[PDB]
DNA sequence: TTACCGTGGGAAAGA
DNA sequence: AATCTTTCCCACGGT
């Protein structure tokens, strides 16, 4: 039912 | 005269102090042939991995027998099984894992499927054994209709593994894979990444934890990528579906197998999942002239999504080295419980050379075929000396055994459980 | 530079 | 014949 994940952060051009 | 049998004061050491011996085999689940003389490569390449201390604990038994470092080096091949195709030989010094970047599978076959088979053994000859892929589909090409359920094999089930690539301008040099490397997201020209694509419901918001939901995945749903080695994940995104170089804002079929996918960034303007060489960014994609429905991507923008799987095999060489190889290795994929108690095992590689074993103790075992063996529960007194009924919740390992000393380590535990 | 090579779009052949 | 899959063809832009 649930996930956990760390979210990495996307950087900009 | 055959060789010794696993003792139980050997089988008591290997549970106290469990050095096994894996070999994981990583590949994509579909291929596309190649005809006449050209070679269309496998991609995502498959790799193959040298895991757990056994493999350290067997270098220094090796040396420590006279063996210099380099017969004691684990040495590798890997080829299409059952053809005439050659086999390529895997670099494996220094490190734990080798991709093999040129197989490719010749027209030549007839087969519908295929496994990968990799061939093992010591720098001084000493034989390991043959180790089999999942099975792999064979293509022609992907068809340019959309996808019907119907078909499942060509379809992308949420909460499964892919690999995603991007290749500029049809090079085989350019050809990058989204892979995790310390802590961060990244296109890298050597290694890839096997992701759960996990489909998430359209009101869920950006957090660490968030439900999954089941299903195959459609072109316009949200969906998470997580590594699945890592943990780390991507922001929620929105897989859409590529036509030349612009994404389609209105598809809604099933995500196929070796299809052109983008990944827009959800709740931003426009922005979609983008390499610039090897490092991994966001960029906006332009409006459509006079189409709103679609929108312009960066050459970056654009990745190819394969459906990856896994095999995996671990042993032990329980009473020291032998003649066999330890190949095929059994492996046990469930347990179910069945006059006297008796547990089936359910699974792949069987033979009647094998025992199961519940810790120490070897159980009577009835071999039936490759994939289904029955053996008798010992009574609970042969782990609790005083019980003539199961007082307490006891749990033991459960281990398959060959006659020749082999340790096939399963995952799984067979629990005795009291008379409610 | 030339010779050679995966790859993807497209033509042709098969069902 | 008409339409989708399989096989054959070939050039871009890489080494």
Redesign the pocket.
């Given at each position: 039912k649930k996930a956990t994940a760390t979210t990495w952060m996307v950087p900009t051009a | 005269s055959p060789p010794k049998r696993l003792t139980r004061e050997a089988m008591r050491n290997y549970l106290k102090e469990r050095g096994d011996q894996t070999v994981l085999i990583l590949h994509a689940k579909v291929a596309q042939?190649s005809?006449?003389n050209?070679?269309?490569?496998f991609?995502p390449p498959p790799c193959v991995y040298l895991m757990g201390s056994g493999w350290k604990k067997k270098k220094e038994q090796m040396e420590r027998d006279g063996c210099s470092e380099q017969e004691s080096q684990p040495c590798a091949f890997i080829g299409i099984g059952n053809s005439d195709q050659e086999m390529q030989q895997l670099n494996l010094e220094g490190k734990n894992y080798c991709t093999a970047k040129?197989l490719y599978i010749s027209?030549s076959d007839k087969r519908k499927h295929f496994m990968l088979s990799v061939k093992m053994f010591y720098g001084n000859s000493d034989d390991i054994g043959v180790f089999l892929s999942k099975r792999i589909k064979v293509?022609?090409?992907p068809?340019?209709?959309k996808q019907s359920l119907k078909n499942a094999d060509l379809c992308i089930a949420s909460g499964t593994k892919v690999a995603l690539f991007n290749?500029?301008?049809?090079?085989?040099?350019?050809?990058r894979y989204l892979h995790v490397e310390g802590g961060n997201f990244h296109a890298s020209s050597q290694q890839w990444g096997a992701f759960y694509i996990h489909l998430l419901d359209d009101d869920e918001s950006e957090g660490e934890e968030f439900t999954v939901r089941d299903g195959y995945i459609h072109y316009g749903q949200t969906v998470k990528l997580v590594c699945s080695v890592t943990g780390m994940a991507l922001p929620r995104l929105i897989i859409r579906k590529v036509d030349?170089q612009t994404a389609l804002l209105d598809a809604d079929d099933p995500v196929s197998q070796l299809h052109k996918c983008a990944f827009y960034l959800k709740d931003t303007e426009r922005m979609y999942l983008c390499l610039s060489q090897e490092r991994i960014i966001q960029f906006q994609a332009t409006p459509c002239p006079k189409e709103q429905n679609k929108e312009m991507i960066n050459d970056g923008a654009s990745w190819?999504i394969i459906s990856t799987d896994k095999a995996e095999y671990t042993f032990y060489e329980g009473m020291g080295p032998v003649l066999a190889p330890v190949t095929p290795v059994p492996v046990v994929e469930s347990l179910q419980l069945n006059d006297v108690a008796m547990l089936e095992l359910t699974g792949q590689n069987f033979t009647p050379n094998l025992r199961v074993w519940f810790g120490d103790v070897e159980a009577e075992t009835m071999y039936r075929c490759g994939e289904s063996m029955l053996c008798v529960v010992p009574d609970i007194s042969a782990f609790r000396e005083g019980w003539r009924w199961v007082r307490q919740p006891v749990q033991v390992p459960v281990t398959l055994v060959r006659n020749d000393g082999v340790i096939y380590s399963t995952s799984l535990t067979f629990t005795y459980t009291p008379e409610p």
């Open positions: - | 042939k005809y006449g050209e070679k269309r490569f991609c040129t027209d293509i022609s090409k068809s340019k209709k290749r500029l301008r049809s090079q085989t040099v350019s050809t030349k190819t």
